[PDB]
């Protein structure tokens, strides 16, 4: 409830608990560099990536215009004009404000086991294609942010695999 | 569905079919519609044969019981606002104003004492009835100042500004172990269809 | 379980116990069944230290609070129904039938004026309490005729069918800066234990 | 989220903001807290314009409407509890105790009969309200004994321990077909602005 009345993105990990804000995370500089179909550069290779194309489905849920009660002002609402009306009950302005602030997956790729990946973490993404003439794909943005990781070793291989998502 | 309680105002009270009905517009989620198409509400009596008029502009509860449906709602009661910068209570209760002042009589037994937050003060249609934590209850006229009712101290007193009318048809006592008195403005009558009998101690006339 | 409200219908008021409650039959899910298997219910008092008693055959709200069981009722408030062609408020308030036609009297101010969907009405047990938007209050009782109160212009008068009775222990003080008036139908008697003075500008004792 | 009905206990009534509210403390989940913490909750008023105080140490059934947030409590009405060994109704109405003994009055038409489980008997802030079965309305001061009402054969008594006021600026009618009985304990005077007329059959005046 705090991270949402706040606006910020939450995750404890490795002895922390983080509180990191929206606005901010849009205007990081990025720090690796994760490439496919490029064999000669400098950063690290992507084998395998999922594209998802369904923004509808994450933002269905935060169409609403919130509304709520207040005993010495009356009816607060915030939000858009033309969606539809939600109640909620704590009538804080900038409480509301922040309601409607996530951030939209996008991406899914499968590396071979970095375990610097963790959530939080700013990276640039550059795909090209495998046939026809070497066009890069432009439907997926430069600058991603890290949401989920999951690592994984059997007694041969240590892989890991990520999820990648863009603020909205 | 609708569950729970909602705020609504009440819109008009002239029901087209007369089964004692209000019409109501709850607060956000009826914006923007007709006042013809707005629904007609019910009402929870507090006894039985009893009615309480609604009047237009009224703030209230209201639930729908019959599975959630928004077509037959249901009137809890009255809900408290102060969006206007000061509660909804009459303010001898609050203390945001000044409140009822009534006329001034010689003799006059105290009027009741009032203290914001311990009494129990009601105000509507030009009626206001107290009952105070001293134990004094009073019923007053507000546009003219008639009252009934004793004080904390235990006294009666029975104001009337215009006319008064005390009749029984039967026996009728009056005794005061105290002094009696009587006075007039005007002129005074004594009638009697039968005997009079004066019983004191002396009996003075003068001019 | 049962979560909302229900109508139902009073059935008993003799509790086992002694823990003041009430027997009643849910409308449609409790039919069919022997009076001495109906649950017991208890009510929500509107003041503190206050009981409104229930008769047999009134109509009220009924919800369970306790998880939705059913062995443990609450009673909200009546309720309205229509069931007999008519509303089942009093006939003054609702303009379905003649209601209270009081008895006649000589001299007597004026009687409350009643509209319909505009004045508190309420009669139960044979007393009768009207609270009109004008501004009157008014007490009366139905098997007499006997009334208390004041009227919409601001008038006092109270009336007695048979006895009445006014004593105070102390100062007692009657005012009328009009003509005061005293009539008697049988004997009257003045006693007092002292002085007495008759302060007028002329005197007269007729026949 | 809480949803239901919940029996609380008012706590406390200085509401540090002014918007008429009460402090609340839920029985069985808020156990344990300092009272500084504990939420302030708003009530259900019974008319428009009316306010009904609460005393500490009170119980009332607490739900919260928004969204079942417990940060917003709302005050629906008073409960019943029995965990004294009787019930929390004054004893006129259940039978468990004796109740109020009115002074004995020579004269003073009887006072009302009450029976249990049939009366409307109020008692808050030393201030008793009766409506019987028989149709008799009664307000009287508990701790001096003065009652404004009638009887259920119809009669009205007014009896004020200590001084008594009757005044009406206007016209004043006294009127008794029976035989009108005016009695003093110390010094009895008839003060008339003008003419003074005793009109009876025949007119005694002894010692």
Same mark, same amino acid.
């Given at each position: 409830?705090?991270? $949402?009345?706040?606006? %910020?993105?939450?995750?404890? %990990? $490795?002895?922390?608990?983080?509180?990191?804000?929206?606005?901010?995370?849009?205007?990081?500089?990025?720090?690796?560099?994760?490439? %496919?179909?490029?064999?000669?550069?400098?950063? +690290?290779?992507?084998?395998?990536?999922?594209?998802?194309?369904?923004?509808?489905?994450?933002?269905?849920?935060?169409?609403?215009?919130?509304?709520?009660?207040?005993?010495?002002?009356?009816?607060?609402?915030?939000?858009?004009?033309?969606?539809?009306?939600?109640?909620?009950?704590?009538?804080?302005?900038?409480?509301?404000?922040?309601?409607?602030? +996530?951030?939209?997956?996008?991406?899914?790729?499968?590396?071979?086991?970095?375990?610097?990946?963790?959530?939080?973490?700013?990276?640039?993404?550059?795909?090209?294609?495998?046939?026809?003439?070497?066009?890069?794909?432009? %439907?997926?943005?430069?600058?991603?942010?890290?949401?989920?990781?999951?690592?994984?070793?059997?007694?041969? $291989?240590?892989?890991? $695999?990520?999820?990648?998502?863009?603020?909205? | 569905?609708?569950?729970?309680?909602?705020?609504?105002?009440?819109?008009?009270?002239?029901?087209?079919?007369?089964?004692?009905?209000?019409?109501?517009?709850?607060?956000?989620?009826?914006?923007?519609?007709?006042?013809?198409?707005?629904?007609?509400?019910?009402?929870?009596?507090?006894?039985?044969?009893?009615?309480?008029?609604?009047?237009?502009?009224?703030?209230?509860?209201?639930?729908?019981? =019959?599975?959630?449906?928004?077509?037959?709602?249901?009137?809890?009661?009255?809900?408290?606002?102060?969006?206007? #910068?000061?509660?909804?209570?009459?303010?001898?209760?609050?203390?945001?104003?000044?409140? =009822?002042?009534?006329?001034?009589?010689? #003799?006059?037994? !105290?009027?009741?004492?009032?203290?914001?937050?311990?009494?129990?003060?009601?105000?509507?249609? #030009?009626?206001?009835?107290?009952?105070?934590? *001293?134990?004094?209850?009073?019923?007053?006229?507000?546009?003219?100042?008639?009252?009934?009712?004793?004080?904390?101290?235990?006294?009666? =007193? !029975?104001?009337?500004? *215009?006319?008064?009318?005390?009749?029984?048809?039967?026996?009728?006592?009056?005794?005061?172990? !105290?002094?009696?008195?009587?006075?007039?403005?005007?002129?005074?009558?004594?009638?009697?269809?039968?005997?009079?009998?004066?019983?004191?101690?002396?009996?003075?006339?003068?001019?």
């Amino acid at each position: 409830e705090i991270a $949402r009345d706040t606006g %910020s993105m939450c995750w404890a %990990s $490795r002895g922390m608990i983080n509180f990191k804000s929206m606005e901010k995370m849009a205007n990081a500089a990025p720090s690796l560099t994760y490439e %496919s179909a490029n064999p000669n550069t400098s950063g +690290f290779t992507i084998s395998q990536f999922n594209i998802l194309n369904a923004d509808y489905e994450y933002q269905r849920r935060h169409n609403y215009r919130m509304a709520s009660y207040d005993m010495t002002k009356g009816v607060v609402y915030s939000g858009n004009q033309e969606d539809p009306i939600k109640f909620t009950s704590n009538p804080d302005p900038t409480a509301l404000a922040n309601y409607n602030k +996530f951030i939209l997956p996008r991406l899914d790729m499968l590396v071979e086991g970095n375990a610097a990946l963790t959530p939080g973490t700013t990276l640039k993404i550059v795909v090209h294609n495998t046939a026809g003439d070497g066009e890069l794909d432009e %439907s997926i943005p430069d600058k991603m942010i890290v949401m989920s990781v999951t690592h994984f070793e059997d007694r041969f $291989r240590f892989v890991s $695999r990520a999820q990648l998502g863009v603020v909205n | 569905s609708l569950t729970g309680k909602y705020r609504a105002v009440v819109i008009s009270v002239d029901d087209p079919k007369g089964l004692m009905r209000t019409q109501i517009r709850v607060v956000g989620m009826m914006d923007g519609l007709p006042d013809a198409s707005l629904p007609w509400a019910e009402a929870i009596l507090s006894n039985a044969n009893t009615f309480s008029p609604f009047l237009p502009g009224d703030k209230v509860w209201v639930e729908f019981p =019959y599975n959630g449906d928004s077509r037959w709602p249901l009137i809890i009661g009255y809900a408290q606002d102060a969006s206007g #910068g000061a509660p909804n209570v009459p303010p001898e209760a609050s203390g945001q104003g000044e409140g =009822y002042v009534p006329p001034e009589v010689e #003799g006059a037994p !105290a009027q009741p004492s009032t203290s914001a937050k311990k009494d129990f003060i009601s105000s509507r249609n #030009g009626l206001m009835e107290i009952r105070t934590a *001293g134990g004094a209850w009073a019923v007053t006229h507000l546009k003219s100042g008639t009252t009934i009712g004793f004080n904390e101290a235990g006294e009666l =007193y !029975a104001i009337s500004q *215009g006319p008064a009318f005390i009749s029984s048809a039967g026996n009728l006592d009056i005794k005061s172990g !105290a002094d009696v008195a009587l006075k007039a403005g005007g002129s005074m009558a004594i009638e009697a269809s039968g005997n009079l009998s004066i019983k004191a101690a002396q009996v003075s006339v003068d001019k």
